Design a binder for these strands. Structure first.
Lengths: 100, 34, 86, 56, 115
RNA sequence: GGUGAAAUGCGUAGAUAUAGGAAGGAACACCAGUGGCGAAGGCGACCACCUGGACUGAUACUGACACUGAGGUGCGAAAGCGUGGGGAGCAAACAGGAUUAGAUACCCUGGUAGUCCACGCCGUAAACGAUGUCGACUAGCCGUUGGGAUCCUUGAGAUCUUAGUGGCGCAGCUAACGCGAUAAGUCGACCGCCUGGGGAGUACGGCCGCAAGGUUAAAACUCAAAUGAAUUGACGGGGGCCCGCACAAGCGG
């Protein structure tokens, strides 16, 4: 159940992430899946190259999607996207906040 | 270094003396420290 | 195996409501878990380390039935007529 | 308390200068928290919040 | 040409010592090996011959400028630290040495142990 | 200018090589720990999904449902074996190149099987803790892993309690070495096994395997021994200390 999705997007595409996330929220709410936390971090600088970039845009979110809601959410960057690296990280509960 | 392949029988031979030189370090020096 | 499956297999095998431990309930909790694990080993056939946890459930059920059959065949015939055994 | 891949101010205290995780014989850390440390390192390391090698 | 700063490698194997001077555009200027100074055979996989080999990298790099250099060292053999003191003596005020020795994270398996 | 010492791939084809890119397999540094998990064989990157067992805390339930186990039936490192992918690296075979009376080898440069993946087979190892499984009891001290509880409590912690994993050691046992709450002590239940050394885990038979072969398993004949552990010595191309014109300063066939 409870997951903790954190995904990068390519920094040149940093202006539709407000739509990206939004689309991911409405796709999770369509099975009633709650969203306990949603944080957009900065356009942080990576510690190494990912596909020869050096800067990327971090988004973290905490989700209670059922099973197929995750699978379509994971396929919204598995089949294709311009989002890179992400870990879905099954958790056990809801949360509060980070980014100092 | 990592020059040759260490067959994992001879690589699973560890602990040279670390339960002597770090465990009996406070034992064999107790002829003076009492 | 689940929390609410395992509470409901208790619930129709109860025999004096506080009970969860009679060889009725235990054979029913085992037989359900054996059947649901048969889906796993058609899909995961190389998993031998979890077959052994299943064969333990088969043998733990066979000992409990041999216990109950030697002790009260009227409870044995009713349990074996449920659960689709023998 | 339960240390986490987001908390980089805690994770950088057990990362050596070359990027490597420091053992439990150097820092005084319990064996449960060390093996919980070297998972939050390896998640932040994967997620490019921390390098693998010193170089970049 | 005249380039004022460059990055300068030392390949420091057990057999030989290769020193290559480049720029930060990585393109090789002057290479000098520990057997290219007339050694050829057994003897000097030693810090002696890298002291001989690192200076020939120097006075052939003193054609296109190159005052300050950055030293990349790569390899386990002697002549590792006696090629970076044989390098400031040719009139270089090198910034900092840097170690780049390739380490696998588990990698290929190595060859058999010599008997 | 590898090393106990040199020999193969290179320049009207650019030579170890760039600050660069792409592909592909295969293994997952650091963490790493007399650490952990698993019946054993085994299992090391990270995330998800599917799943097994343990540990642990109280409470409720069943009421001897238990222990072991000849047969049997599963699972078993490696290497081998079919059948099909794969193929970096490494590399039985084998080619050379050395080294030596020779070198059929140890060293070098290569390198196909194999290693890797899928399904099927084999069913063996110094498969070892050379120690069957289960249960009960018998001085202590020092670590450590997973829990729990008490402790003025800050824990920098401390104590008892459990289930593991180690180091010493009393009683006891042991031929000795040694084992010593993880017994090789004290007892109990059941099983497997052994009966001098060779012959020999071999023939013949049976069963199994596609094969390689495995498993069950002898006799003739032969010898007075093999064998264990400790002791003194001698010895070592074992180690550590020590000495002497032993090592080289201003001698001479």
């Amino acid at each position: 159940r409870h997951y903790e999705i954190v995904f990068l997007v390519h920094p040149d595409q940093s202006e539709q992430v407000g739509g990206m996330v939004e689309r991911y929220t409405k796709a999770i709410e369509e099975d009633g899946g709650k969203i306990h936390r949603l944080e957009d971090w900065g356009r942080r600088q990576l510690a190494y190259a990912i596909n020869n970039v050096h800067k990327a845009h971090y988004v973290l979110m905490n989700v209670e999607c059922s099973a197929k809601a995750l699978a379509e959410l994971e396929d919204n960057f598995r089949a294709n996207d311009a989002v890179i690296r992400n870990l879905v990280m099954r958790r056990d509960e809801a949360v509060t906040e980070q980014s100092e | 270094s990592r020059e040759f392949y260490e067959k994992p029988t001879a690589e699973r031979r560890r602990k040279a003396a670390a339960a002597v030189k770090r465990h009996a370090k406070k034992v064999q020096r107790e002829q003076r420290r009492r | 195996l689940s929390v609410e499956e395992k509470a409901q297999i208790v619930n129709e095998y109860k025999q004096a409501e506080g009970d969860t431990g009679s060889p009725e309930v235990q054979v029913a909790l085992l037989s359900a878990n054996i059947n649901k694990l048969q889906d796993h080993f058609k899909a995961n056939g190389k998993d031998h380390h979890s077959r052994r946890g299943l064969i333990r459930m088969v043998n733990q059920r066979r000992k409990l039935l041999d216990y109950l059959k030697g002790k009260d065949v009227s409870r044995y015939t009713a349990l074996i007529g449920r659960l689709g055994l023998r | 308390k339960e240390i986490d891949y987001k908390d980089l101010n805690t994770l950088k205290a057990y990362v050596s200068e070359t990027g490597k995780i420091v053992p439990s014989r150097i820092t005084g850390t319990k064996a449960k928290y060390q093996r919980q440390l070297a998972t939050a390192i390896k998640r932040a390391r994967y997620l490019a919040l921390l390098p693998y090698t010193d170089s970049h | 040409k005249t380039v004022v700063d460059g990055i300068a490698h030392i390949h420091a194997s057990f057999n030989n010592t290769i020193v290559t001077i480049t720029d930060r555009q990585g393109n090789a200027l002057s290479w000098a090996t520990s057997g290219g100074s007339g050694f050829r055979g057994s003897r000097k996989s030693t810090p002696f011959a890298a002291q001989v080999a690192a200076e020939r990298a120097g006075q052939a790099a003193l054609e296109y400028g190159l005052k300050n250099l950055d030293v990349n060292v790569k390899g386990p053999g002697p002549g590792r630290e006696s090629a970076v003191r044989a390098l400031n003596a040719c009139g270089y005020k090198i910034a900092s040495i840097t170690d780049v020795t390739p380490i696998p994270h588990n990698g290929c398996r190595p060859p058999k142990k010599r008997r």
